[PDB]
Structure 1
Amino acid sequence: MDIKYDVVIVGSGPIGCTYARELVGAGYKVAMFDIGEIDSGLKIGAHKKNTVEYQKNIDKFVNVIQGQLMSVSVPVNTLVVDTLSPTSWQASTFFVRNGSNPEQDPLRNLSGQAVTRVVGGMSTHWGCATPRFDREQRPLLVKDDADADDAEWDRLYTKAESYFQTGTDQFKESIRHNLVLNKLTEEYKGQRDFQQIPLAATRRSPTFVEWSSANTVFDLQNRPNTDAPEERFNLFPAVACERVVRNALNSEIESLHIHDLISGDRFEIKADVYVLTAGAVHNTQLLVNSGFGQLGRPNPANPPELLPSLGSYITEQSLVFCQTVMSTELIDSVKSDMTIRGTPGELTYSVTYTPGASTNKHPDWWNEKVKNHMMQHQEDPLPIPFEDPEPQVTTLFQPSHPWHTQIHRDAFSYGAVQQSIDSRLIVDWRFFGRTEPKEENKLWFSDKITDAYNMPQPTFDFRFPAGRTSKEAEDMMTDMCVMSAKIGGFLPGSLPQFMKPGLCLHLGGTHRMGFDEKEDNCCVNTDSRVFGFKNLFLGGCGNIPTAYGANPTLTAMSLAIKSCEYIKQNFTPSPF
């Protein structure tokens, strides 16, 4: 490790990697630090689902996710256990126990909020959905010129989608996908449009998808190397970044203070350009630990001198979930083109179709898969092939349905009784609401309590705002109930429900972007540069200042690409 770099990046998630990709490629001398460790195999920061074993056992992947989601703020537990033996020790109170946060009101929490400390961040486990935001969900990059604003978002999103390998056709040969997609298209004809979820992923075979991650955006190998001999990058895992040091003018950052978790030593790192990409929670924590905003319980009697909107206007999406069991009408549709003679299991049994029959409802390839499955597996009562890929359907947020939708399968822990239902029949429904930004919704940091890395303990004061946010959240639930019924009835044990606040992990607005710090109540400008500061930039969902229902990562990467254009234009790389 050197003491001096051109650019330093805190965090190795996909947004840090966007900075790294752009800036290492532009010839800057780049250091990236991550508090977490390399643990994705040889492809550093890659998606953990890209092993043969998870692609054959996809439900086991829920365990990978849960093993790397650490709860941000857990209130003090007041559950009564009154069946201990009389000999067991007990306190007379519900004292601060088991890593609970005593600052936290259990009634104004994001209990489901969690963070991932590993190289590649949350992109080592994410679902890879990368929709664009429409105007209504999206912050302005150009004022008073909607067409110009669209054009700019298009340019940036297009690059972001290249970096992530975003596509919309990886699931097109799935029977189940097409069965759901087509039924919903038909039922909402003239009302709504349905398409494949845009997914950051590349299909490698009929049974293997290479999901994208940080590693797709930038491979995270130290440079110079044989493939990039004139580039300069170092990744330092297991380094806790603790503070950026402001000059007295509050015009420039002068160093980054780090803690090496292996040696235990603390150091200062010097760079021309400082980029914080530690996530929406941890960017805020680092800034507040460096004297931005206000440490401690909000006190309006005592407004902070720097970045007074930091940690305010936070947004998290409401999330509703259920699973369905496919309808009889739809399963029978699968085999509509088939003539069936005899009885399954006997010698005379015959399942046939007429390729090219004008009265065929399905393409020949679909009918071939189905005939073959029914003739090869005559003990199986369903017409869907065993290895048929999952459904991946969306109707994207619109004004008349202001929520994002995912009609799909991801890894799930089915209970014993649920395991009784054939997996081919099951479809997951996740609808995501948009949350109005409100000054009163805050992420703050204790002045007394510390977390596991000895940093100020994060505390939420959040409730879903009254008015539109709450009305839409309930209308969203009703919409999932109505839409899901077109495909099948609910799966017992996975009935319609709101998920605990923050489980969707789409937190935004913690360090929000705008044109003008006071008028737009914000922390960074449209180049993601911290107001007042020449050389400090923030990346990630914390930048997003709007009420959004779609998955935010693509939008955050897009802002990061814009931010790097500013850097390339304003800082010269050192000579090599």
Structure 2
Amino acid sequence: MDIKYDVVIVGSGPIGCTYARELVGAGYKVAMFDIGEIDSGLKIGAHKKNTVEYQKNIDKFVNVIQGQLMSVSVPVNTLVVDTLSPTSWQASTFFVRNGSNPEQDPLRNLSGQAVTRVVGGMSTHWTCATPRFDREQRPLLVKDDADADDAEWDRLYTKAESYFQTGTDQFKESIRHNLVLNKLTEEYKGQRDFQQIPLAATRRSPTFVEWSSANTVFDLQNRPNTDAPEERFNLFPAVACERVVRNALNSEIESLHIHDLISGDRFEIKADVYVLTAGAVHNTQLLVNSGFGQLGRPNPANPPELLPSLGSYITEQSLVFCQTVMSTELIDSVKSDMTIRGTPGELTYSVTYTPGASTNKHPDWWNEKVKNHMMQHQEDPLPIPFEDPEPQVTTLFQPSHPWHTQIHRDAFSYGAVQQSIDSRLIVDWRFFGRTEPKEENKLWFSDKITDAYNMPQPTFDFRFPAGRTSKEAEDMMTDMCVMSAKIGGFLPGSLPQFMEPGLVLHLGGTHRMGFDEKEDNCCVNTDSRVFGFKNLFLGGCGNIPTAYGANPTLTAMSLAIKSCEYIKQNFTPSPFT
């Protein structure tokens, strides 16, 4: 292991991989460190649901997700257990137990917020939804020129869509998808538009979708190698990056202090450029542990020397959720073009349609699928083929409905009573609200309590702001109740509800971007460079300073691409030696 690199990247999630793809491919000698380890098969950092076993039983994948989410801040537990035996040891107080954080006010938390420490970060389990932000959700890249701003965003998004292999066509011939899409299109004719959720994925077969991940962006293989003989890249897993060392003038980073978790050794690693892509919480922790912002409980009478906005203006989306069970009317519509003769299971049972007839309400391919299912499976009471893919429907955020929507299926933990309902009938509804950035909403770090890696313990001070955020969040729940009813009634056990704050994991604004440090209350400029520092960049959702409803990864990636362009103009790659 060398002492000296051109570029060091902290974190191997999709944003770290965006920096790696750009900088490795432009000839820089790059090292990337991740506190977590390789565990996605031979494709390093790839999507864990791309195994044949998970494509066959998607519902088991929820356990993979839960297995790699570690709660950020867990308040001291105050549950009374008063049925212990009189011989068991019993507390006299609610003391600090089981990794809980005594700094945490349980009523001002993001209890759902969690982090993932594996190579490839959260992109080894994510849902892969990559919509663009419209103007109202999107940070400015060009001031006082809307057309140049639009064109810069379109350029960046288009490259990012390339890196993720985003597409809107992978579910085009699913009967359920089209059944839902067409009904909502009709119901909202001239009011709202519906389309497929943009998904980072490529269909390989009618029963296999290769979901994208960090690996799609950059394969994380050491270079040079055979396919890439001129490139230079080393990945170091199980390495905790602990701090960047500031020079006395606060104008440059001099090294990156690391702790090898296998060997136990500590090093100082030196590079021309330091990139932090450790996620929205862990970028902030690393910065704070390096003397940026303020350690300990916020004190507005003792302002921090550096980046006073760091860890303020934090945003997290409101999320509402329910599931539905498809209406009788919709289910009967699936077989509207069929002529049915006889009795199921008998010899003279016949299901037929006339292909191409003008009276047919469905296309030939749909009718063929339905006829074959009904004919080959006469014991089954539903017209939807067993292997029909799930719906993947959205109407994107607009000013008259300012929430993102997903009307679809992902991995779900059904209760035994719910497993009673045929899976083909079930549709998930998830509406995501935007949250106004407010100075009082903070992520801070204890000066006494430490986490499992002996770093200052993250603590939230968060409430959904009064005013627009709150009114919109409740209007959003109503909208889901109204819209979902057009498809079917709620599934018992999955009734309309707000999710635990932060369970969405779309945390933003912890190290937010803007044009001017003071005027825009921010930490990085539009090249993602830390103000004042020549050689320190941050990537990820923590850069996004706006109120957004849509899934933010694609936007973070777009910013990271722009960041790499600055880097490419301002730093010279070492010569191949």
Between the aligned partners of 1:259 and 1:506, the Cα distance in structure 2 is 28
**Which residue pairs with 1:559 in the alignment?**
559
Between the aligned partners of 1:88 and 1:177, the Cα distance in structure 2 is 56
**Which residue pairs with 2:540 in the alignment?**
540
TM-superposed CA distance for 1:435, in Å, is: 0.2
Provide Cα deviations, 1:175-221, integer angstroms capped at 9, x if missing partner. Answer: 00000000000000011000000000000000000000000000000
Between the aligned partners of 1:452 and 1:80, the Cα distance in structure 2 is 26
**Which residue pairs with 1:60 in the alignment?**
60
TM-superposed CA distance for 1:99, in Å, is: 0.5
Between the aligned partners of 2:149 and 2:185, the Cα distance in structure 1 is 30
Provide Cα deviations, 1:220-268, integer angstroms capped at 9, x if missing partner. Answer: 0000000000000000000000000001110000000000000011000
Between the aligned partners of 1:91 and 1:122, the Cα distance in structure 2 is 38
Provide Cα deviations, 1:347-378, integer angstroms capped at 9, x if missing partner. Answer: 11100000010111111010000000000000
Between the aligned partners of 2:327 and 2:266, the Cα distance in structure 1 is 61
Between the aligned partners of 2:216 and 2:462, the Cα distance in structure 1 is 35
Between the aligned partners of 1:179 and 1:365, the Cα distance in structure 2 is 14
SS at match of 1:107: helix
Between the aligned partners of 1:81 and 1:565, the Cα distance in structure 2 is 58
SS at match of 2:474: helix
Q: How does 1:440-479 map to 2 (within 5 A)?
A: 440-479=440-479
Structure 1 segments (4+ residues) deviating >6 Å:
none
Between the aligned partners of 1:68 and 1:183, the Cα distance in structure 2 is 37
Between the aligned partners of 2:405 and 2:277, the Cα distance in structure 1 is 27
Between the aligned partners of 1:266 and 1:453, the Cα distance in structure 2 is 14
Q: How does 1:118-137 map to 2 (within 5 A)?
A: 118-137=118-137
Between the aligned partners of 1:430 and 1:264, the Cα distance in structure 2 is 44
Between the aligned partners of 1:362 and 1:235, the Cα distance in structure 2 is 52
In the superposition, the TM-score normalised over structure 1's length comes to 1.00
TM-superposed CA distance for 1:325, in Å, is: 0.1
SS at match of 2:37: coil
TM-superposed CA distance for 1:343, in Å, is: 0.9
Between the aligned partners of 2:136 and 2:297, the Cα distance in structure 1 is 33
SS at match of 1:256: strand
Provide Cα deviations, 1:379-399, integer angstroms capped at 9, x if missing partner. Answer: 000000000000000000000
TM-superposed CA distance for 1:147, in Å, is: 0.9
Provide Cα deviations, 1:460-486, integer angstroms capped at 9, x if missing partner. Answer: 000000000000000000000000000
Q: How does 1:56-95 map to 2 (within 5 A)?
A: 56-95=56-95
Provide Cα deviations, 1:44-81, integer angstroms capped at 9, x if missing partner. Answer: 00000000000001000000000000000000000001
Between the aligned partners of 1:27 and 1:332, the Cα distance in structure 2 is 60
Between the aligned partners of 2:273 and 2:208, the Cα distance in structure 1 is 40
TM-superposed CA distance for 1:526, in Å, is: 0.2
**Which residue pairs with 2:46 in the alignment?**
46
Between the aligned partners of 1:272 and 1:203, the Cα distance in structure 2 is 41
Between the aligned partners of 1:573 and 1:42, the Cα distance in structure 2 is 30
Provide Cα deviations, 1:120-172, integer angstroms capped at 9, x if missing partner. Answer: 00000000000000000000001111111000000000000000000000000
Between the aligned partners of 2:333 and 2:252, the Cα distance in structure 1 is 65
SS at match of 2:101: coil
**Which residue pairs with 2:6 in the alignment?**
6
Provide Cα deviations, 1:496-523, integer angstroms capped at 9, x if missing partner. Answer: 0000000000000000000000000000
Between the aligned partners of 1:204 and 1:361, the Cα distance in structure 2 is 29
Provide Cα deviations, 1:541-573, integer angstroms capped at 9, x if missing partner. Answer: 000000000000000000000000000000000
Cα root mean square deviation, aligned: 0.3
Percent identical across equivalent pairs? 99
Between the aligned partners of 1:534 and 1:125, the Cα distance in structure 2 is 35
Provide Cα deviations, 1:266-300, integer angstroms capped at 9, x if missing partner. Answer: 00000000000000000000000000000000000
TM-superposed CA distance for 1:39, in Å, is: 0.2
Between the aligned partners of 1:207 and 1:28, the Cα distance in structure 2 is 40
Between the aligned partners of 1:512 and 1:14, the Cα distance in structure 2 is 19
In the superposition, the TM-score normalised over structure 2's length comes to 1.00
SS at match of 1:62: helix
SS at match of 2:436: coil
TM-superposed CA distance for 1:326, in Å, is: 0.2
Between the aligned partners of 1:81 and 1:449, the Cα distance in structure 2 is 26
Between the aligned partners of 1:485 and 1:499, the Cα distance in structure 2 is 20
Between the aligned partners of 1:267 and 1:136, the Cα distance in structure 2 is 45
Gap runs ≥5 in structure 2: none
**Which residue pairs with 1:290 in the alignment?**
290
